[PDB]
Amino acid sequence: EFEERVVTINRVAKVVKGGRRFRFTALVVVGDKNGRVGFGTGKAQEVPEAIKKAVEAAKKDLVVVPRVEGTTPHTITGRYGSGSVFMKPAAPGTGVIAGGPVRAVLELAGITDILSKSLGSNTPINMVRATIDGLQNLKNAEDVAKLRGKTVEELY
Amino acid sequence: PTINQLVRKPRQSKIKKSDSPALNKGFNSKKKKFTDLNSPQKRGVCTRVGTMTPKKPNSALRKYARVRLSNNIEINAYIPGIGHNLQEHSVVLVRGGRVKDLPGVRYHIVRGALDTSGVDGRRQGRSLYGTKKPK
Amino acid sequence: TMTDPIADMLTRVRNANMVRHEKLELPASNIKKEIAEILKSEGFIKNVEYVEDDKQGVLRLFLKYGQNDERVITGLKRISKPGLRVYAKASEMPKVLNGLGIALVSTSEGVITDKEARKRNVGGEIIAYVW
Amino acid sequence: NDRKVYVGKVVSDKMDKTITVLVETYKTHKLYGKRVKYSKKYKTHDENNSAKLGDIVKIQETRPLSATKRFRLVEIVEES
Amino acid sequence: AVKIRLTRLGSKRNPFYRIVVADARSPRDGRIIEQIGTYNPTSANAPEIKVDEALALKWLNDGAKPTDTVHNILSKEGIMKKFDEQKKA
Amino acid sequence: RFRGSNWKKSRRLGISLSGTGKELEKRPYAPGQHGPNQRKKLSEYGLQLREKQKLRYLYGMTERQFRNTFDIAGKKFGVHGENFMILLASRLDAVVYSLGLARTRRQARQLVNHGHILVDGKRVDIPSYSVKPGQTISVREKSQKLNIIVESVEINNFVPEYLNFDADSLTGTFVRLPERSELPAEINEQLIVEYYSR
RNA sequence: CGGUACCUAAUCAGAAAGCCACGGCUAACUACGUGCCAGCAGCCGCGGUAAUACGUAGGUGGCAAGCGUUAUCCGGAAUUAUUGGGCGUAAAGCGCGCGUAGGCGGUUUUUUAAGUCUGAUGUGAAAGCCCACGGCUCAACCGUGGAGGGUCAUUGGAAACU
RNA sequence: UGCAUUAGCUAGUUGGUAAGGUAACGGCUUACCAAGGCAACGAUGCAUAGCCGACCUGAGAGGGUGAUCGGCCACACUGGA
């Protein structure tokens, strides 16, 4: 189930010699609670198509987040442009404490044991990019030991 | 920087110039000096009482007063409320609290405390403006 | 007039790791060859090879990757420098990427690694958080 | 018992039996952890003008024989 | 001189003395020489006498004196009764 | 504490467990003046505030009684959202309502403060005293019967999990502490823990 | 202190909460004046005769003997950025130098154990500070038991790197 | 603690030489000898402030309060004996 989360409504006014438009764009985050997470937007007007074309746009790319279960396996961060996020793994019995673009990809993957020091910008585009571009750069233990050519259980 | 020259010159922090400079100052009356003890409200006495025009395009005449504090600093203090007992020479109490869209005047006048009573005809802002709770 | 040998040597690896190289080398010392041994002791590369030349001969790297045209060496950074020589305690020594990297340890016990100093009960001069 | 028996190396022997050795070591900024060299000369009494120029003099503290003379001589190694 | 006393604790109208053998020149809650034991006589039944009598053998033999209320719980609990043979040396 | 009449309280909050139910008489959307309108929600930050409001108003205490137990829920290193409830379930507030000593809790939480309930022996005047499980939660023998004391014992049996009872002057035992499955889903206990995170 | 606290009985359902908004931030709205006036005003701002924003009044709301204002230190805030900041056009290179001090320096071997990092203890402070009980009607508020320093000293050492 | 919009600081000073005298030490003072000693690592001077434990909030890196509550220092109209 491609779990939806909206960010905002919008209005854009292109002042010309004539008249300005009433485009109502948006941007959403679409995860699945499995470690296969996307996000999407669209220059739309319809609040359904603000979801629908963007849910279609998020289903242009669901990124593969490797999840050693129970939390996010490492103490990680994010990076895009002028913004950057941060995640520290923690206990399960906490209650998730994060924000708007830093909680979004973190809650639609079912992990719930993390931190959030959302550094960088306040523009949610490159923020939720950094929430995604950091998270896509995650790696597990078993594939890297395959990639390095050691064994999996040799790493502790 | 370098951590070498950070020993040679440390990260000295930044100061913060605090608002309301007339409320964190006393007066050594014996030696004509000044103390700094940060009162909530320092009392004073009115010298002039008038009003002022907001230069921002909101339009009113908001009433202010030229008050001299205990430490004899002359201010321009906003007199909130509608009616008052502030003709002249009222020995009043003065808070901080800036009124925006009004240059220079950044102090309130504590209603109903020192020598004024508060305003009368209020029924939604009763705890302020000197009105005791009815019945 | 370079000051950190083990960092410019380490960033030259990442200098060609970006453009997907499979073969580079580095100069030698008493340390830096044996430092390059601890990489291929874990075996992150195919094999680091022999020192040949007159003074600090080139010892190869042979960068070993994944089958999806990938790279294994994510993150390459010496932490110490001339001006800041940093050390580690064995009792609160961390894990690089929470158990997905390595962190080597340098003292007069022989230049050891994260596994080779957690059960050695010595710390030392830590260098690389390479994951 | 004993007294403190620190070391040094001379800088200026003053007129009539006052040598001045130099001690220096490495203190840190605890905010930074980076240590830095720093010096603290502790002036010793030379009993018989024993120490010379270049001498890495090990001395030993006493109670004040004079205003500055807190330390007395035990060990002298070389000279330039 | 140096002497055993009654240095108290506890909330309002409720004392918790831990005994202290120290000088008379200090205040009653001042800096001490030795906090030996506690004594809470104010209970419903007990005096709650906890005593490590090993150090009364030292101090009462070279300068410390029991003084007029700390003397006679030692004659009650038997702290100085063991000292009665230890002073009989 | 609260000190109300719960007939409108079943309609006001999420739920507050008045009796069998009180919403079916009038329109149960809202009590009045603005309800059947553009029905607006509030935030998840306000939903956990509302989920706090479905349990602060349910248990009837104030803050720093529902809030100062939350830091001792940080002393017990289990699930913070439910180990908070098991210490909240371990007091004398479960007695004056659940085991029937009145038609509500208010007439019976009066009855402990007179010294007419007298749990664990002589007298415990206060309900903030946690019922440390094992003490004989008793009844004063000089107040054995009323119009309220033995009446709702017959109405409401099943004194809840890890609190037994009797008709031997209506005395209990409170043999252990009940878990989160002995905590009702009338208000979701997991969604209080993040309003106290904020 | 004090016959104060406490226990018995009698007693009436007895004699007791206040305050700011109801604009968007933020859950709590509507009518009378009102006509940029009175006035509110944390930022954006309301009032020009149809104000939800002012002022007048019922609901509620946040939570209880407080509520609100005022001023004062900290987090929020990595706007002092060791951790964790920039110097082309945004604030950050003098007009360039040369140069005194200072800082920091290529490469490869061997000595010390000084610096590093460990191991035997003593071992770091009383309300403050780890963990678990005891005392408080709960509790407010006071003790217990090691933990104990895992930082400093008395002590043994190890040389890649300084 | 900070100021170089405080840089040159000291001359019984700076070392020693003899008397004191102190529970002891010596430039501590007195007769002698050289200008030495102190310094940009900011001596000197200015301005400000009892110190510490302790408080307090900070992820840690910690640093701000002292009514508190303890330990030490200084004071008792002022200034000397």
TrEMBL record, chain A:
<dbReference type="GO" id="GO:0003735">
    <property type="term" value="F:structural constituent of ribosome"/>
</dbReference>
<dbReference type="GO" id="GO:0019843">
    <property type="term" value="F:rRNA binding"/>
</dbReference>
<dbReference type="GO" id="GO:0005737">
    <property type="term" value="C:cytoplasm"/>
</dbReference>
<protein>
    <recommendedName>
        <fullName>Small ribosomal subunit protein uS5</fullName>
    </recommendedName>
</protein>
<feature type="domain" description="S5 DRBM">
    <location>
        <begin position="2"/>
        <end position="65"/>
    </location>
</feature>
<dbReference type="GO" id="GO:0042254">
    <property type="term" value="P:ribosome biogenesis"/>
</dbReference>
<dbReference type="InterPro" id="IPR005712">
    <property type="entry name" value="Ribosomal_uS5_bac-type"/>
</dbReference>
<keyword id="KW-0689">Ribosomal protein</keyword>
<dbReference type="GO" id="GO:0015935">
    <property type="term" value="C:small ribosomal subunit"/>
</dbReference>
<dbReference type="InterPro" id="IPR014721">
    <property type="entry name" value="Ribsml_uS5_D2-typ_fold_subgr"/>
</dbReference>
<keyword id="KW-0699">rRNA-binding</keyword>
<comment type="similarity">
    <text>Belongs to the universal ribosomal protein uS5 family.</text>
</comment>
Automatic annotation (TrEMBL), chain C:
<keyword id="KW-0689">Ribosomal protein</keyword>
<comment type="subunit">
    <text>Part of the 30S ribosomal subunit. Contacts proteins S5 and S12.</text>
</comment>
<dbReference type="GO" id="GO:0006412">
    <property type="term" value="P:translation"/>
</dbReference>
<protein>
    <recommendedName>
        <fullName>Small ribosomal subunit protein uS8</fullName>
    </recommendedName>
</protein>
<dbReference type="GO" id="GO:0005840">
    <property type="term" value="C:ribosome"/>
</dbReference>
<keyword id="KW-0687">Ribonucleoprotein</keyword>
<dbReference type="InterPro" id="IPR035987">
    <property type="entry name" value="Ribosomal_uS8_sf"/>
</dbReference>
<dbReference type="GO" id="GO:1990904">
    <property type="term" value="C:ribonucleoprotein complex"/>
</dbReference>
<keyword id="KW-0694">RNA-binding</keyword>
<dbReference type="GO" id="GO:0003735">
    <property type="term" value="F:structural constituent of ribosome"/>
</dbReference>
<dbReference type="GO" id="GO:0019843">
    <property type="term" value="F:rRNA binding"/>
</dbReference>
<dbReference type="InterPro" id="IPR000630">
    <property type="entry name" value="Ribosomal_uS8"/>
</dbReference>
Automatic annotation (TrEMBL), chain D:
<dbReference type="InterPro" id="IPR019979">
    <property type="entry name" value="Ribosomal_uS17_CS"/>
</dbReference>
<keyword id="KW-0694">RNA-binding</keyword>
<protein>
    <recommendedName>
        <fullName>Small ribosomal subunit protein uS17</fullName>
    </recommendedName>
</protein>
<keyword id="KW-0689">Ribosomal protein</keyword>
<dbReference type="GO" id="GO:0003735">
    <property type="term" value="F:structural constituent of ribosome"/>
</dbReference>
<dbReference type="InterPro" id="IPR019984">
    <property type="entry name" value="Ribosomal_uS17_bact/chlr"/>
</dbReference>
<keyword id="KW-0687">Ribonucleoprotein</keyword>
<comment type="function">
    <text>One of the primary rRNA binding proteins, it binds specifically to the 5'-end of 16S ribosomal RNA.</text>
</comment>
<dbReference type="InterPro" id="IPR012340">
    <property type="entry name" value="NA-bd_OB-fold"/>
</dbReference>
<keyword id="KW-0699">rRNA-binding</keyword>
<dbReference type="GO" id="GO:0022627">
    <property type="term" value="C:cytosolic small ribosomal subunit"/>
</dbReference>
<comment type="subunit">
    <text>Part of the 30S ribosomal subunit.</text>
</comment>
Automatic annotation (TrEMBL), chain F:
<dbReference type="InterPro" id="IPR022801">
    <property type="entry name" value="Ribosomal_uS4"/>
</dbReference>
<keyword id="KW-0699">rRNA-binding</keyword>
<comment type="similarity">
    <text>Belongs to the universal ribosomal protein uS4 family.</text>
</comment>
<dbReference type="GO" id="GO:0003735">
    <property type="term" value="F:structural constituent of ribosome"/>
</dbReference>
<dbReference type="InterPro" id="IPR002942">
    <property type="entry name" value="S4_RNA-bd"/>
</dbReference>
<dbReference type="GO" id="GO:0015935">
    <property type="term" value="C:small ribosomal subunit"/>
</dbReference>
<keyword id="KW-0687">Ribonucleoprotein</keyword>
<keyword id="KW-0689">Ribosomal protein</keyword>
<keyword id="KW-0694">RNA-binding</keyword>
<dbReference type="InterPro" id="IPR018079">
    <property type="entry name" value="Ribosomal_uS4_CS"/>
</dbReference>
<comment type="function">
    <text>With S5 and S12 plays an important role in translational accuracy.</text>
</comment>
<feature type="domain" description="Small ribosomal subunit protein uS4 N-terminal">
    <location>
        <begin position="1"/>
        <end position="89"/>
    </location>
</feature>
